[PDB]
Each structure stands twice: as structure tokens, then as C-alpha cells.
């Protein structure tokens, strides 16, 4: 408070003074700016004038010439003049052309695209680690692969071992595969690209690889980056039948994803999170240990663990003193953590239909009973015993 304002007050009037000194004594000397400066800006503007025609640099020839394509049809063998970085002009780049006699007078253009914005999450999830009730061991296999080499890159470089690459979070539904991704995406504050696996099937032919080549290029540019692929199970199992390339198409796209993930490229820093619920379907080439390094696995929360999960959802909630948290845990016998969240949400909704702020013991008992009936047991382990 006292000292931060006090040092800023000295720095910001000392900055003022130095900028005045540089401005006065570089205007009276003609070798620096002065005479060249007041004529180049006015000339550069005036000579080329307007309209500046945008075009696309089709290709560049090493001799400061180029072949540029106007949308109006005529192509041109132009020259590359003043005020352009000649290494920045490459195929695909958009250039501004001098309309009287076609020469590249520069590129001033950001070229912002909806292709980079669609991958990008401006995420601010209220979730932080330790909104995961228990399953503490699993959290600390994920943080050692993704988050920790950004905090302390010292440990892996002292040891001499290359950081582990890639993870797959799989298990039963409701164990928080998505909830862990959100915790670890919040801390790192790396570029977090998100792309659901369903999107990689689209109707046209051969578009699958173009879409898959695009995602990883945005990521490699934005290192350090995370690419979370949600339910990559979806492309194997389903058959939307919009894509008229059939199953042959889905296979050729898959092979593209395999090359972008390691292959020949030698990309920058790109961690990958691959969430799935059924690892069987997934092509054995993808899961192969070399592209992914650690296969984290989850299981159905226990009776001791479910107390921790319940404590998180019941804290935010307002309660009467008549509630007993312990009788809601024991009745359910092996029910995931997704159901516990819905059981709290359902109770607060019953109390809001009765229009009383408190969530009493009865709203909990009606909600818990309704949620057990909605479920559907598991005829996988019923077969068994």
C-alpha cells in the first residue's frame, strides 16, 4: 500500500522526463529521424494512395518478385517494395497491392480466422482440484504428466528422462473423466484447445483429414498447449450415415490422426488428454504406448469415498438441522458420483416447487428414491454372482 504507491510515483515521473529528452534532441538532428521521417510517411502514403487491392500471394520467387492473384482474375508478376518483411510473405498469405502498378506495398494484416476461434476455449471453470471428492491417487497420476513439467521443468532435466507424453482417462461412466480434465486445464494456464471426437465425422469426402490436420497446427503454434479429445470412442462405435464415404472414410481419417499425434512432423509441445468410456473399441494403433505413455484407469467410488463427494455438493447447499447426511450414503450401494450430484440437484428442485429456501430431510428422501429407479442396475456383474 504505502511503499507500492511511493515507488510508482517516482518511476512514472522519471519515465516522463526521459521521453521528453529523447523527443527534443532527436528532432534537431537530421541524421536520425527529422528530415527523413517527415517525408517518408507522407510520401509512402501519397504515392500508392487508394484503393489498396487485397490479393493472395500464390507463390514467391527468390529474387524479390512474386506471382499474386487478384480476385478480379488478372495474375501479375509483381515486385516486392519498401516496408515489407520478405520472410513473412509465404504461400497463402494475404498482401496489399499498389493499384496503379501492381507491387506489394506490404502486409499489415492480422488475418484472424473463425478456424482458430472454434478450437479455442476462453475457459474460466469454477472447478479447481479438490472439487474431486477423494480418488486422490488418480489425481496424482494426471498432474505428474500434464501440469508438473510446466511448473518445474528442472526435475526432468536433472534426471535426464524425457517427460511422459499423453494420457487416456477411461473407466466407468460417472467417475469424472471430464471433471478431472477441467481441474487440470484450469491450473496450467496453457492454451487449452477442446475438440469433441464426434466432429471428426462430417458429410463430405476427404474433409476428415483436412479438419484433423488443422487442429494440431493451431496447437503447435500456441505451445505450451493441451488438446483434449472428448469421447474419441464415438467415431468407432457409431455410424451417423451422413458421411457417404462409409466405413472406409472413417478409417482413412483415423490414420491421419495417428500421424499428427507422433509421425514425422516433430511438433512442438502438445500434451494430449484422451477421454473415453470404452477402450476396447479404440484402434490398437492409437492406444499403443509411444504416443500415449500412461493409461490412467478409474473405478466406481467406494462407500468411504462417497462421503467426500457428498460433502462437496452439500456444502454449497442450505440445509435444515433435521437432515442426516449419513443415511443418504448407506442406502445406495455402489452408485457413481454423477448420481450423487443429481440427487442434490433434484432435492433442491423439490424444495423450490414448495417454495421454501431450506432443503429439509423429506426433500432428500424423495429425491434419493427417485434417482435409484431411474438408473438401470448393471446386467454385466449380475451375470456373475
Amino acid at each position: 500500500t504505502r511503499c507500492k504507491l511511493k515507488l510508482l510515483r517516482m518511476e512514472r515521473i522519471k519515465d516522463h522526463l526521459l521521453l521528453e529528452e529523447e523527443f527534443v534532441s532527436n528532432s534537431e538532428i537530421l541524421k536520425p529521424f527529422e528530415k527523413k521521417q517527415e517525408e517518408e510517411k507522407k510520401q509512402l502514403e501519397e504515392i500508392r494512395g487508394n484503393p489498396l487491392s487485397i490479393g493472395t500471394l500464390e507463390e514467391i520467387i527468390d529474387d524479390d518478385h512474386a506471382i499474386v492473384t487478384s480476385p478480379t482474375m488478372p495474375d501479375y508478376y509483381v515486385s516486392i517494395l519498401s516496408f515489407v518483411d520478405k520472410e513473412l510473405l509465404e504461400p497463402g498469405c494475404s498482401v496489399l497491392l499498389h493499384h496503379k502498378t501492381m507491387s506489394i506495398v506490404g502486409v499489415l494484416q492480422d488475418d484472424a480466422d473463425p478456424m482458430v476461434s472454434v478450437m479455442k476455449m476462453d475457459k474460466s471453470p469454477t472447478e479447481s482440484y479438490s472439487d474431486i471428492g477423494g480418488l486422490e491417487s488418480q489425481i496424482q497420476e494426471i498432474k505428474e504428466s500434464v501440469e508438473l513439467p510446466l511448473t518445474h521443468p528442472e526435475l526432468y532435466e536433472e534426471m535426464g528422462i524425457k517427460p511422459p507424453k499423453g494420457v487416456i482417462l477411461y473407466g466407468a461412466p460417472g467417475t469424472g473423466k471430464t471433471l478431472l480434465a477441467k481441474a487440470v486445464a484450469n491450473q496450467t494456464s496453457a492454451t487449452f484447445l477442446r475438440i469433441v471426437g464426434s466432429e471428426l465425422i462430417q458429410k463430405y469426402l476427404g474433409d476428415g483429414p483436412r479438419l484433423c490436420r488443422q487442429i494440431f497446427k493451431v496447437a503447435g503454434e500456441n505451445a505450451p498447449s493441451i488438446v483434449f479429445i472428448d469421447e474419441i470412442d464415438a467415431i468407432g462405435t457409431k455410424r451417423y450415415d451422413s458421411n457417404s464415404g462409409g466405413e472406409r472414410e472413417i478409417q482413412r481419417t483415423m490414420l491421419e490422426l495417428l500421424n499428427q499425434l507422433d509421425g514425422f512432423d516433430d511438433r512442438g509441445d502438445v500434451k494430449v488428454i484422451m477421454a473415453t468410456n470404452k477402450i476396447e473399441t479404440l484402434d490398437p494403433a492409437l492406444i499403443r504406448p509411444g504416443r500415449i505413455d500412461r493409461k490412467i484407469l478409474f473405478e466406481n467410488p467406494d462407500l468411504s469415498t462417497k462421503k467426500k463427494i457428498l460433502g462437496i455438493h452439500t456444502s454449497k447447499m442450505n440445509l435444515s438441522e433435521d437432515v442426516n447426511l449419513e443415511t443418504l450414503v448407506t442406502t445406495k450401494d455402489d452408485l457413481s458420483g454423477a448420481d450423487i450430484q443429481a440427487m442434490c440437484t433434484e432435492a433442491g428442485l423439490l424444495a423450490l416447487r414448495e417454495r421454501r429456501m431450506q432443503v429439509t430431510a423429506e426433500d432428500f428422501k424423495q429425491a434419493k428414491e427417485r434417482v435409484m429407479k431411474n438408473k438401470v442396475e448393471e446386467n454385466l456383474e449380475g451375470l456373475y454372482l
Binding site: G49, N50, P51, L52, S53, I54, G55, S70, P71, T72, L96, L108, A112
Partner: protein
């Protein structure tokens, strides 16, 4: 008098340099605007000194005077994409009283 001063001088105004209609794609902080004349490509061109670049914003149909294509004025009508998709589907407004049953 307003009439006859206008008729005689009207012949010299009708040898117009023409005009064009573009649309603001995006602006930049050199006081210049990227506008698309529809049949052709796009052009980066500056505003006349009098209007501002603050007046101009997302997808305003703009006037141009064909010579340097100088932007002259915002046009009454705007073109916005989200209104046009809900218009072509065509769903008529309803009320709780119509549903009743």
C-alpha cells in the same frame, strides 16, 4: 429561385464519378477499413477525414464514391446473419393461451 439555380447546375452534377456499395468486414487502427464490393474482391481504403472510424462497426453496409472508393456514409439498412436464419425457417409467435389443452 431554388428551382432555377438547381436546374441549370444539374447538368454538371450528373456527370457523376458513380458510387459503389460494400460492407465493413473489419477495421484496423490505421483509420482504414476493409470493405467488399460484392462481385469483385475486397479493398482496404481510408475514410474521408470528416466521418470517424468509431462510427463504423460490425457489418454496416457502407457507401463509396468510385475514384478512390472513399467511404462517405453509413446506410440506413443493416445486414445481420442471425436474423436471416430465423426468418427463413418461419415460426410464428405463440402464447400460453393458444397452447391451452
Amino acid at each position: 429561385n431554388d428551382k432555377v439555380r438547381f436546374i441549370k447546375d444539374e447538368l454538371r452534377l450528373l456527370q457523376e464519378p458513380g458510387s459503389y456499395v460494400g460492407e465493413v468486414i473489419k477495421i484496423v487502427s490505421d483509420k482504414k477499413v476493409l470493405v467488399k464490393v460484392q462481385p469483385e474482391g475486397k479493398y482496404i481504403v481510408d475514410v474521408a477525414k470528416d466521418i470517424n472510424v468509431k462510427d463504423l462497426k460490425a457489418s454496416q453496409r457502407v457507401c463509396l464514391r468510385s475514384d478512390s472508393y472513399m467511404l462517405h456514409k453509413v446506410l440506413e439498412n443493416k445486414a445481420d446473419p442471425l436474423v436471416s436464419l430465423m426468418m427463413v425457417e418461419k415460426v410464428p409467435d405463440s402464447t400460453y393461451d393458444m397452447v391451452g389443452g
